[PDB]
Design a protein around this ligand. Structure first.
Ligand SMILES: COc1cc(N2CCC(N3CCN(C)CC3)CC2)ccc1Nc1ncc(Cl)c(Nc2ccccc2P(C)(C)=O)n1
Length: 312
């Protein structure tokens, strides 16, 4: 056995077991609805998100590839599949993240978000991404829009549409034609269509930047065709006003031209955990102590990290 068998269970749900309530979104992805799921016999009601896309055989092929990935994942900072409903068009059933996506959250709560929240989101996105590195998955679409908010204290990574499982020997995913978001893409991915976990580290840099700028558009007012050139010259995204050189040097390292020089997601967990232990030393936000949402024993404990944050 070259690779290990995937013994994950695919749960199939009855259309009668769940009730749609509202539409949450529409667009390229298709449409996402909010619902309740009463599993038959169990005196339990589960708040769910039902995702779909008229029927097309080319469309159902892609939604079932996504369900494959989502049913294989199991981490507190990764969105998992609750089940699939086999109707006219295939429906994806996942957990409802009541606070919506993280991009719209940072925009809405711009003046109530404190350093402690921002740095913790950074630790959590890294933990979820380190899980994907462990499972040999290359997300290929990490952005603040693809991070959902369960509570302001707990975030999870979503959208496994472009995700690719790498073989125990395979170390790069050579893509072909297809619409990829350029502003979040690593330089190697724009020039050679190569995707590694290190190319995901790049996209993590831009996500951290989106959070720190309270939801700004990377390279705002710059056409897609230019981004390849701008990055080749040595230009990167600017230093966000709330950022200390310490946080910005982490971002800048995620954008190294040499992929192997960029930090590993487990190094990003360690680095953002230390910063989350004194958040005011790393993010300068006016009114940090009033901003709300719904300590040692020995020598210098600056480099102190809890075992839960020290992965390998
Ligand atoms: C209560 O549930 C939600 C509400 C909102 N929004 C709806 C617009 C609302 N707006 C904000 C702007 N404001 C001016 C006016 C009110 C803010 C809250 C967003 C998301 C979820 N939950 C949720 N669970 C699971 C999924 Cl999986 C999902 N995903 C999802 C939901 C919608 C579209 C796309 C996705 P994706 C990224 C493509 O999976 N989304």
């Amino acid at each position: 056995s070259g690779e290990a068998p995937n013994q994950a269970l695919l749960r199939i749900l009855k259309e009668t077991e769940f009730k749609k309530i509202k539409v949450l979104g529409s667009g390229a992805f298709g449409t996402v609805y909010k619902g309740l799921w009463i599993p038959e016999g169990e005196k339990v009601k589960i708040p769910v998100a039902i995702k779909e896309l008229a029927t097309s055989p080319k469309a159902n092929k892609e939604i079932l590839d996504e369900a494959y990935v989502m049913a294989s994942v199991d981490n507190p900072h990764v969105c998992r599949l609750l089940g699939i409903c086999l109707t006219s068009t295939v429906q994806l059933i996942t957990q409802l993240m009541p606070f919506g996506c993280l991009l719209d959250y940072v925009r809405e709560h711009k003046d109530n978000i404190g350093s402690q929240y921002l740095l913790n989101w950074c630790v959590q996105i890294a933990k979820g991404m380190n899980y994907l590195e462990d499972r040999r998955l290359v997300h290929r679409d990490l952005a603040a829009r693809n991070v959902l908010v369960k509570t302001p204290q707990h975030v999870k990574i979503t959208d496994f549409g472009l995700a690719k499982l790498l073989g125990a020997e395979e170390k790069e995913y050579h893509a072909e034609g297809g619409k990829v978001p350029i502003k979040w893409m690593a330089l190697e991915s724009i020039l050679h269509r190569i995707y590694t976990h290190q190319s995901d580290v790049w996209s993590y840099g831009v996500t951290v930047w989106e959070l720190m700028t309270f939801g700004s558009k990377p390279y705002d007012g710059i056409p897609a065709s230019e981004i390849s050139s701008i990055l080749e010259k040595g230009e990167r995204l600017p230093q966000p006003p709330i950022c200390t050189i310490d946080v910005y040097m982490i971002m800048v390292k995620c954008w190294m031209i040499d992929a192997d020089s960029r930090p590993k997601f487990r190094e990003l967990i360690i680095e953002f955990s230390k910063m989350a232990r004194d958040p005011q030393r790393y993010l300068v936000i006016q009114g940090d102590e009033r901003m709300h949402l719904p300590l040692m024993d020995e020598e210098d404990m600056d480099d102190v990290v809890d075992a839960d944050e020290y992965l390998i």
